[PDB]
Amino acid sequence: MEKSQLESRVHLLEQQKEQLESSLQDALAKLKNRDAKQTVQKHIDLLHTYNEIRDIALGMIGKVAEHEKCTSVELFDRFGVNGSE
Amino acid sequence: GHMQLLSRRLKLEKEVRNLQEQLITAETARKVEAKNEDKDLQTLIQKWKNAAQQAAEVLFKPMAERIRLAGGVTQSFRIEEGENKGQIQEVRTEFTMSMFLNQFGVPVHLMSFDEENGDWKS
Numbered sequence: 001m002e003k004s005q006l007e008s009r010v011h012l013l014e015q016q017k018e019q020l021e022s023s024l025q026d027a028l029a030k031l032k033n034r035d036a037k038q039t040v041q042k043h044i045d046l047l048h049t050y051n052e053i054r055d056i057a058l059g060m061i062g063k064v065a066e067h068e069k070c071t072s073v074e075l076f077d078r079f080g081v082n083g084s085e
Numbered sequence: 086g087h088m089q090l091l092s093r094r095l096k097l098e099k100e101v102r103n104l105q106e107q108l109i110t111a112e113t114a115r116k117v118e119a120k121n122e123d124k125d126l127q128t129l130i131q132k133w134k135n136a137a138q139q140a141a142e143v144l145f146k147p148m149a150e151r152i153r154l155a156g157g158v159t160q161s162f163r164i165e166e167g168e169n170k171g172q173i174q175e176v177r178t179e180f181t182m183s184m185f186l187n188q189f190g191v192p193v194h195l196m197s198f199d200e201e202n203g204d205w206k207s
Contacts, residue, residue: 006090013097020104027111036107036114043117046126050133052195057133059189060140079136085129 057081137196138205145185152180 028034065072076082160176182198197206
């Protein structure tokens with residue numbers, strides 16, 4: 001690669017970087033909260049926890065349902081849940 | 086020379102990757118805000134947590150008693166020193182809620198029993 005050619009790649013990277021800083025500013029402008037990393041992480045941790053504890057709860061309620069010889073849904077009220085949750 | 090240019094290419098390439106990553110994050114945040122479900126998720130977590138705890142207490146109690154009426158729990162390890170080197174060292178102890186929850190694959194941080202105070206943790 002000649003020096004010339006390398007200068008051309010470096011100037012393209014400069015313009016790529018500028019355009020990305022501009023696109024990022026526009027993307028952040030659409031957010032109520034500009035700390036996007038906090039927003040996304042808080043959501044990921046809540047979804048994690050929710051999927052895990054509902055799974056576990058369904059497992060245990062299913063075992064109680066086995067001992068009582070019934071379908072799991074029949075015990076949902078006793079445990080304070082329903083199937084749209 | 087050209088090493089200043091080479092060094093600047095590498096620095097710009099890193100900055101571009103970092104900005105590309107921030108851009109995705111900012112796009113994801115926009116969708117997370119539009120869904121607006123964090124409150125739903127917190128509410129739902131307490132409901133299902135309350136359910137799992139209640140169900141754990143119903144299942145645990147007679148399980149603990151069945152176990153107890155066949156020796157309880159055996160804890161085992163191998164003896165590594167002394168004239169008994171090789172033998173496995175055994176013991177017996179009661180089945181606890183925490184063994185139960187572990188038996189049910191419940192991460193300690195999700196749901197835990199305060200084995201001393203005899204109730205569930207926040």
